[PDB]
Design an enzyme around this catalytic site. Structure first.
Site, short mmCIF file in Angstrom:
data_model
loop_
_atom_site.label_atom_id
_atom_site.label_comp_id
_atom_site.label_asym_id
_atom_site.label_seq_id
_atom_site.Cartn_x
_atom_site.Cartn_y
_atom_site.Cartn_z
N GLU F 59 0.83 -1.20 0.00
CA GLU F 59 0.00 0.00 0.00
C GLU F 59 0.87 1.25 0.00
O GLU F 59 0.53 2.25 -0.65
CB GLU F 59 -0.94 -0.01 1.21
CG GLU F 59 -1.74 1.28 1.40
CD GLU F 59 -2.18 1.51 2.83
OE1 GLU F 59 -2.21 0.53 3.62
OE2 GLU F 59 -2.49 2.66 3.19
N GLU F 136 6.73 6.02 10.66
CA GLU F 136 5.30 5.95 10.93
C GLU F 136 4.99 4.97 12.06
O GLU F 136 4.01 5.16 12.78
CB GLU F 136 4.54 5.56 9.67
CG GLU F 136 4.07 6.75 8.87
CD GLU F 136 3.78 6.41 7.43
OE1 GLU F 136 3.38 5.26 7.17
OE2 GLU F 136 3.96 7.29 6.56
#
Ligand SMILES: CCCCCCCCCCCCCCCCCC(=O)OC[C@H](COP(=O)([O-])OCC(O)COP(=O)([O-])OC[C@@H](COC(=O)CCCCCCCCCCCCCCCCC)OC(=O)CCCCCCCCCCCCCCCCC)OC(=O)CCCCCCCCCCCCCCCCC
Ligand SMILES: CCCCCCCCCCCCCCCCCC(=O)OC[C@H](COP(=O)([O-])OCC(O)COP(=O)([O-])OC[C@@H](COC(=O)CCCCCCCCCCCCCCCCC)OC(=O)CCCCCCCCCCCCCCCCC)OC(=O)CCCCCCCCCCCCCCCCC
Ligand SMILES: CCCCCCCCCCCCCCCCCC(=O)OC[C@H](COP(=O)([O-])OCC[N+](C)(C)C)OC(=O)CCCCCCCCCCCCCCCCC
Ligand SMILES: CCCCCCCCCCCCCCCCCC(=O)OC[C@H](COP(=O)(O)OCCN)OC(=O)CCCCCCCCCCCCCCCCC
Ligand SMILES: CCCCCCCCCCCCCCCCCC(=O)OC[C@H](COP(=O)(O)OCCN)OC(=O)CCCCCCCCCCCCCCCCC
Ligand SMILES: CCCCCCCCCCCCCCCCCC(=O)OC[C@H](COP(=O)(O)OCCN)OC(=O)CCCCCCCCCCCCCCCCC
Ligand code: HEM
Lengths: 47, 55, 418, 98, 56, 440, 51
Positions: F59, F136
């Protein structure tokens, strides 16, 4: 209301950190901020 | 609303002494003999009072 | 799905209704009652007023409103900008009369009981602290305080010293002077127009006039700097641009989307953003930059918002500002303006997809302009905007006096003058 | 006359001999506590000093001079509307609960 | 299983758990006393009054 | 309309299929904008311990270039038409979608097929995204709710691939190679597991022609899914440096296709939600919300019904200061018990109204409808109409709520996550005893 | 009383009636067992042998 809200509101709680440019992207403001409150909904702010 | 176990003045004392009392997780069988003593006491009061009904 | 029906009553109240036949109905009462109508003596009155819905009214107690709106799965929300307050009730289409009676009691017959008002001062602190957990809320508050002298200088949030001091008399005076018919627009999505008229007849007969006539916003051109050490520095640098609903305002919208006005692609690179590319040419640290557009009835603010590392704050700001100056120097192609127009038009059409967005657009249109115009007219107004209009707008920003607000560790943040 | 009986009973009850009003003597249950909590501060402070003075008077087994007694026609039912509203709210909650 | 059935029918609710305990206490007292007594009178067979009474 | 005629007037989701097995589904309106996306039956629960995180990595690389559109070119195209490209990943589903103008649907559809079919997966980009994904991960560590729900999944589904996080451990992030990612795409991005959804001003015949022109190459017409054992268990991470504690408690709830979901959702609406920025506070019909507002016991609480194909997490998450966790547990479990034994018709009516309102209000805009279509075809193999949801809600009463909350909540072992100053989070035996009533 | 009555309280009564009658049977059996009340116990087949 019936739906919980994308984000619940803890005061006195650190929210989130941003460490990458990818995460920082979209956090700059472009429009004047509005403030929203609700009987049974989390309060929100928008910019 | 409240939990009457924590709010009721008598139940608050009971709760803090034997329910919500923080106890060390590692006390051994040797730490049982406190509760045995208090049980022995009760037994002595119970049988003795029944002895004192005839003595 | 029928057509939007828009009428204006002799009392000056506007009513607009679109029966889309959707299972849910949404009713909004829009009022010219933002914080721009406060003065130095009643700051925070309108913030407490925003928090004050669901308090006891002449026609329903607080318990009655809470319990009776939750019984039908309904929603009562109050959304404020600096210029407007919107009270929205949303529920299923069979329960709209109950919610409308509640909404009309909330707006037309508020009681502001002294003990309920004194038990509501704590949510001023809670609400403002929750908002200020976002570093942009206070930067935008300071940007308005430093860009304006009086009216739009007022915060959407209560001053800390004013918390626990906003009185019921201030709330009553505020409602009596801003919640008047010729300042109100009742807009219902998923309702019949005669129903909204009967609703607007049973109540909303306060004065049928213009209430308190607030002051014109005076450009200040100041600077507010908030050193607080935060890992990032948020800086906003603006000039006065134009009032909403004008050719210049549309040129400023096209200029916002030329410079870059937020990300289109998740975790992307903001390739079509000229400001972002200018900053990313030299700044290899995490950053964000966008163009900032804030249009109001009597004025507007156009500029740049940057988020950066404390060390690279100056480089990011100078890079963005010089890109804007390069557009002001006449460096702007037709393809970039076509792309900006496409972004702007697609964003406008996507904003009104939701019932909330369409209701907000209709309400703001009825307040600001007193008339509704379809999206096709909006889009051809965007199309009419020429290249020279964008070039300008950029010139006006460059040559215009600047107001700046920064927050974070500002040891490397420039001043408005340097 | 009902008011003859009423003024007779007001004299005979004798809280006027202590400078008290009728609403000063009410038994303080939860409804009455909320009613007293909703009072404006001047009325609350008047109530507090009146009651403190009456307690001070009964501590000495004394009463005020007859000139200082609360006259029957000057008794302010200051707490009555707040109590009625508190009770209305309680009654509404109970009607909802059924 | 059998214990799944017992839990679903008799243990899940505390009132029914308690009723099962009460009925079981009654029947357990009967059966346990019967068995323990038989053991005691077998260990002491012929020695007790009951075993020998029928001669007097 | 009377909300019964309005439900009957909702446009119909039209579904077709390509020969390769790609399903095409669309709900048409007269809006000038559309949302079109691909929803894939791929998630972290399909990953083992060595590949865990590969789907999130894919993704991440999705919009960074395809063999036809190198690097930023794709983004430029999207940005040059005003469209918005978004993606997300869960433990079971993955989605890539575009919000575009209705006249941009061909290009949008083309842009999607390329993205799912021809991602470059270039090694240089894989290293850059490695750095991004590590940052992240550290950003996600700051979010106490995300951490507490990852903890809840990890202890509830321990030993199963549902305990895995979406992003995977940071060691896998550092170790995943291009071969790992190409294998993940080759085994999971298949036409029979993909759904091309579109909601908005989209004609189904035109979308179907687009899918036949852009997706027909995909896999025609195999490892997938093992059940995941649930475990009553607790994971407590104490950090008294944290200002507020997060507590998540869940029992094993039903999977996607179980009708019990509709009454259980009703029951959750009876308990409701709260945070300290609410208008109603003490007057709220939810008992827990009014007690939390009156006593200031918590900053927020939410009920949840997380569903997977065969199991799920049915429970509640709350945030509170250190000295109130116990109270928040006591009043929450009590509410559960009060629902299992004494549900009562009027609050069942309120919860039914709340559920109908949630279902109708959620589907507002092209994007929520597009997600509903894609996720619905993945979880049910069908778009359930709102009229049907209303039929299922209408057949709920207090007897039904009592029975289903008894079946799922009463005398069941919960899974518990605690994060922060959680010394007053009750011992597991005390919570487990709070899952039944002696009076009952 | 007035704060009581109403459909909700009658529904609560109906909801708790099985539990109440079950606890009533529990108290009944426990009282029969503790005091060896033969008035009932003489009818219980196996327990009958204890008398
Ligand atoms: C095999 C060899 C023979 C038997 C063990 C001999 C011996 O010395 O064992 C010590 C050894 C204990 O050594 P320790 O662990 O250093 O003592 C900890 C405490 O005893 C406390 O340990 P605990 O709390 O687990 O309970 C054990 C404790 C329990 O003590 C009591 O309950 C009280 C006894 C006195 C009344 O009893 C003992 O430790 C001593 C023996 C008591 C009589 C048997 O006993 C055991 O391992 C437990 C009992 C095993 C019996 C078989
Ligand atoms: C008859 C069977 C018992 C029964 O119906 O209990 C109903 C009720 C407990 O019902 P529940 O619905 O399971 O409790 C939930 C509550 O919110 C209570 O929630 P909580 O979190 O405050 O307390 C949970 C737990 C907390 O644990 C305790 O209360 C500790 C129990 C004593 C432990 C040993 C203390 C030192 C000796 O409660 C209990 O264990 C049951 C209540 C206390 C019974 C004490 C029996 C002591 C016998 C010696 O207890 C009583 O009504 C007590 C009076 C009746 C007892 C028999 C006469
Ligand atoms: C001299 C003093 C010391 C003497 C010796 C002390 C040691 C022996 C006595 C104590 C033994 C341990 C306790 C055994 C009982 C126990 O744990 O009960 C817990 C249990 C709870 O155990 P639980 O938590 O495992 O199971 C309950 C949960 N459900 C219902 C879902 C299964 O208490 C109860 O169940 C209370 C209700 C039932 C009580 C009995 C009713 C019938 C009684 C007979 C008829 C009436 C008279
Ligand atoms: C040593 C042990 C001493 C005794 C323990 C004292 C504390 C527990 C006893 C009280 C109790 O359990 O009350 C619980 C409950 C009251 O209502 P509930 O909402 O369940 O709980 C709120 C307050 N805990 O109680 C009931 O509802 C009682 C129901 C009837 C009795 C069966
Ligand atoms: C000797 C008495 C029993 C002692 C051993 C059992 C015990 O400590 O508690 C048993 C029973 C269950 O208590 P608990 O598991 O706390 O559940 C309460 C409802 N949530 O807790 C009780 O208090 C049972 C009381 C029975 C009377
Ligand atoms: C205090 C509780 C009551 C104590 C009463 C004295 C105890 C007693 O008498 O127990 C034995 C008795 C056995 O039953 P009995 O009275 O013989 O009647 C049989 C008729 N066919 O059992 C009983 O009489 C039990 C009666 C319980 C109390 C009434 C309910
Ligand atoms: C602290 C607790 C107690 C202890 C340690 C204790 C100890 C004793 C001892 C050792 C005896 C002699 C037992 C024997 O005959 O060999 C005794 C006798 C007796 N105790 Fe206690 N006792 C206690 C409490 C009580 C109480 C509270 C009572 C009265 C209520 C009582 C009443 C009696 C009676 C009546 C006797 C004489 C009957 C007999 O000898 O068995 N006792 N006690």
């Amino acid at each position: 209301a019936a739906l919980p809200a994308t984000s619940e509101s803890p005061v006195l709680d650190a929210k989130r950190s941003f460490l990458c440019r990818e995460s920082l992207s979209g956090q700059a403001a472009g429009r004047p901020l509005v403030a929203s409150v609700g009987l049974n909904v989390p309060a929100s702010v928008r910019y | 609303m409240t939990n009457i176990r924590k709010s009721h003045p008598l139940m608050k004392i009971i709760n803090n002494a034997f329910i919500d009392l923080p106890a060390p997780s590692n006390i051994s069988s040797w730490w049982n003999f406190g509760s045995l003593l208090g049980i022995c006491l009760i037994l002595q009061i119970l049988t003795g009072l029944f002895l004192a009904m005839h003595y | 799905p029928q057509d939007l029906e828009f009428t204006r009553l002799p009392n000056g109240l506007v009513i607009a209704s679109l029966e889309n036949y959707a299972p849910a109905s949404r009713i909004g009462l829009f009022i010219k009652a933002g914080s721009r109508y406060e003065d130095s003596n009643n700051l925070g009155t309108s913030h407490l007023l925003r928090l004050a819905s669901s308090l006891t009214t002449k026609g329903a107690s607080s318990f009655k409103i809470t319990r009776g709106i939750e019984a039908v799965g309904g929603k009562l929300s109050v959304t404020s900008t600096r210029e407007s307050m919107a009270y929205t009730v949303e529920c299923l289409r069979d329960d709209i009369e109950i919610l409308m009676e509640f909404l009309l009691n909330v707006t037309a017959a508020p009681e502001f009981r002294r003990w309920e008002v004194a038990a509501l001062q704590s949510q001023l602190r809670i609400d403002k602290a929750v908002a200020f957990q976002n570093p942009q809320a206070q930067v935008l508050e300071n940007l308005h305080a430093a860009a304006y002298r009086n009216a739009l200088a007022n915060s959407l949030y209560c001053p800390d010293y004013r918390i626990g001091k906003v009185t019921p008399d201030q709330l009553h005076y505020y409602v009596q002077n801003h919640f008047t018919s010729a300042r109100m627009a009742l807009i219902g999505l998923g309702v019949s127009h005669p129903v909204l008229k009967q609703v607007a007849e049973r109540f909303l007969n306060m004065r049928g006039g213009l209430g308190l006539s607030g002051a014109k916003a005076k450009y200040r051109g100041g600077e507010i700097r908030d050193q607080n050490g935060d890992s990032l520095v948020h800086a906003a640098l603006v000039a006065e641009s134009a009032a909403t609903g004008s050719a210049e305002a549309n040129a400023f919208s096209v200029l916002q989307h030329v410079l870059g006005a937020g990300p289109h692609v998740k975790r992307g690179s903001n390739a079509t953003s000229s400001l972002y590319q200018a900053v990313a040419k030299g700044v290899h640290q995490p950053f964000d930059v966008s163009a900032f557009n804030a249009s109001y009835s009597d004025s507007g603010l156009f500029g740049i918002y940057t988020i950066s590392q404390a060390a690279s704050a100056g480089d990011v700001i100078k890079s963005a500002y010089d890109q804007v100056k390069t557009i002001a120097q006449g460096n702007l192609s037709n393809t970039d303006v076509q792309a900006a127009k496409n972004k702007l038009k697609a964003g406008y059409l996507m904003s009104v997809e939701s019932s909330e967005g369409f209701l907000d657009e209709v309400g703001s249109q009825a307040l600001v302009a007193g008339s509704y115009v379809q999206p096709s007219t909006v889009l051809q107004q965007i199309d009419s905007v020429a290249d020279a209009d964008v070039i300008n707008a950029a010139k006006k920003f460059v040559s215009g006096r600047k107001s700046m607000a920064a927050s974070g560790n500002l040891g490397h943040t420039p001043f408005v003058d340097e | 006359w009902l008011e003859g009986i009423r003024k007779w009973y007001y004299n005979a009850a004798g809280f006027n001999k202590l400078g008290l009003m009728r609403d000063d003597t009410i038994y303080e249950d939860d409804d009455v506590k909320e009613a007293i909590r909703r009072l404006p501060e001047n009325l609350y402070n008047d109530r507090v000093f009146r009651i403190k003075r009456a307690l001070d008077l009964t501590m000495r087994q004394q009463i005020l001079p007859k000139e200082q007694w609360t006259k029957y026609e000057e008794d302010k039912f200051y707490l009555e509307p707040y109590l009625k509203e508190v009770i209305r709210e309680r009654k509404e909650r109970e009607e909802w609960a059924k | 299983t059998l214990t799944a059935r017992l839990y679903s029918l008799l243990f899940r609710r505390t009132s029914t758990f308690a009723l099962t305990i009460a009925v079981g206490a009654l029947f357990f007292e009967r059966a346990f006393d019967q068995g323990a007594d038989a053991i005691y009178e077998h260990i002491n067979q012929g020695k007790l009054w009951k075993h020998i009474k029928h001669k007097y | 309309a009377t909300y019964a005629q309005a439900l009957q007037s909702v446009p119909e989701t039209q579904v077709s299929q390509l020969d390769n097995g790609l399903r095409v589904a669309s709900e048409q309106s007269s809006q000038p904008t559309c949302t079109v996306g691909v929803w894939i039956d791929a998630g972290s629960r399909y990953e083992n311990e060595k590949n865990n995180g590969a789907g999130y990595f894919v993704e991440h690389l999705a919009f960074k270039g395809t063999k036809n559109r190198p690097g930023s070119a794709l983004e430029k195209e999207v940005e040059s038409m005003g469209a918005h490209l978004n993606a997300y990943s869960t433990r079971e589903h993955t989605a890539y979608y575009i919000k575009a103008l209705s006249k941009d649907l061909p290009k949008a559809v083309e842009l999607l097929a390329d993205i799912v079919q021809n991602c470059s997966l270039e090694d240089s980009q894989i290293e850059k995204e490695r750095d991004v994904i590590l940052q992240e991960l550290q950003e996600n560590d700051s979010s106490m709710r995300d951490v507490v729900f990852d903890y809840l999944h990890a202890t509830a589904f321990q030993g199963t691939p549902l305990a895995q996080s979406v992003e995977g451990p940071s060691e896998n992030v550092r170790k995943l190679s291009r071969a790992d990612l190409t294998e993940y795409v080759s085994q999971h991005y298949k036409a029979p597991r993909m759904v091309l959804a579109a909601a908005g001003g989209v004609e189904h015949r035109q979308l179907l022609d687009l899918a036949q022109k852009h997706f027909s190459s995909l896999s025609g017409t195999v490892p997938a899914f093992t059940p995941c054992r649930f475990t009553g268990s607790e994971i407590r991470h104490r950090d008294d440096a944290l200002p507020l504690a997060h507590v998540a408690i869940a029992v094993e709830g039903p999977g996607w296709a179980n009708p019990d979901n509709v009454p259980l959702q009703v029951a959750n609406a009876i308990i409701g939600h709260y945070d300290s920025t609410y208008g109603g506070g003490t007057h709220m019909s939810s008992t827990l919300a009014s007690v939390a507002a009156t006593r200031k016991l918590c900053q927020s609480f939410q009920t949840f019904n997380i569903c997977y194909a065969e199991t799920g997490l049915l429970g509640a998450h709350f945030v509170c200061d250190n000295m109130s966790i116990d109270d928040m547990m006591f009043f929450l479990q009590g509410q559960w018990m009060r629902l299992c034994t004494s549900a009562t018709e009027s609050e069942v009516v309120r919860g039914k109204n709340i559920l109908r309102n949630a279902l109708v209000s959620h589907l507002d805009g092209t994007t929520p409808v597009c997600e509903d279509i894609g996720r619905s075809l993945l979880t049910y193999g069908r778009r359930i109409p709102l009229a049907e949801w209303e039929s299922r809600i209408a057949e709920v009463d207090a007897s039904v709520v009592r029975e289903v909350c008894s079946k799922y909540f009463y005398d069941q072992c919960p899974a518990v996550a605690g994060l922060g100053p959680i010394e007053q989070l009750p011992d597991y035996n005390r919570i487990r005893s709070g899952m039944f009533w002696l009076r009952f | 009383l007035s704060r009581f009555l109403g459909p909700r309280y009658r529904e609560l009564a109906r909801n708790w009636i099985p539990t109440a009658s079950m606890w009533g049977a529990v108290g009944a059996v426990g009282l029969v067992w503790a005091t060896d009340w033969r008035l009932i116990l003489d009818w219980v087949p196996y327990i009958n042998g204890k008398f």
